[PDB]
Amino acid sequence: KRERMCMKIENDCIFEVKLDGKVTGYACLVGDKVMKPAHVKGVIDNPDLAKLTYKKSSKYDLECAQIPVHMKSDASKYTHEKPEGHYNWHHGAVQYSGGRFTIPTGAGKPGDSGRPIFDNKGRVVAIVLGGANEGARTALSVVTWTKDMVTRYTPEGTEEW
């Protein structure tokens, strides 16, 4: 269940985007709210949440919604405490050292931005914004908080997916 339980719990959470022959936006409902990278535009699949308005922050490019109760149980427990250990996601494990993320080059691809990541215990940690082809291990660009204050952590030269 190191990743099978992850596959089961990630189901029904990530919502796809299909507007004109392209699938880019991946939105995850977590902590009574939801977010998506606003620098890339997407369309909400289900009409129930689509008609509801969303927040828009220019310098954080994330949205928000007031999700009702009939899908209230479609989120994680969102802990906030980060040792230096493997975390794993949909494509390969996660390497965390020196307060930073690194995934070897070619494991992912542009357009995969929006996939949330979460620990071995099943607790959500961050959502990837993009990365740049650095050597043999592409860095990441995610959001991390200490009980509050979501922050952007983008190394030098990162390129958005």
Add this chain to the structure above:
Amino acid sequence: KRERMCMKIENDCIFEVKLDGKVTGYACLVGDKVMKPAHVKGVIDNPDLAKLTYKKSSKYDLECAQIPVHMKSDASKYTHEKPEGHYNWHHGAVQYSGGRFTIPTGAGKPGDSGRPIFDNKGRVVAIVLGGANEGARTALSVVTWTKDMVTRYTPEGTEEW
């Protein structure tokens, strides 16, 4: 399996300095930057790395340069930790106690400065600059940091190699 994995670790990291029949300075890819003993003249072996400009220090006699965006795949973890024990270097183990890097007599020679002294666990600790023999032992002179504020230590009679 005591030092071979380390020997693999610092492969492709140390560069060369040689202009006409002399090989002294050894640049180490530590902390997303390069440096070499300022007490000797340093000509960069790889033309790619020599395009950037470097900084100069008076007593710390070390340089710096923001690394390009495709050589972080060969970076150590360089975590600050100073216990007493054996850490090993390019030629044999190293004995450290009482804030003094010390080597058995005879294990040094001129033109070997710039060797990254690294811990037994695989993290680089410091860079070799110079030293001299004192009785049955030879002292060293390196740069260490307590998570910040790199410092310097120098015994009397020291000779830079």
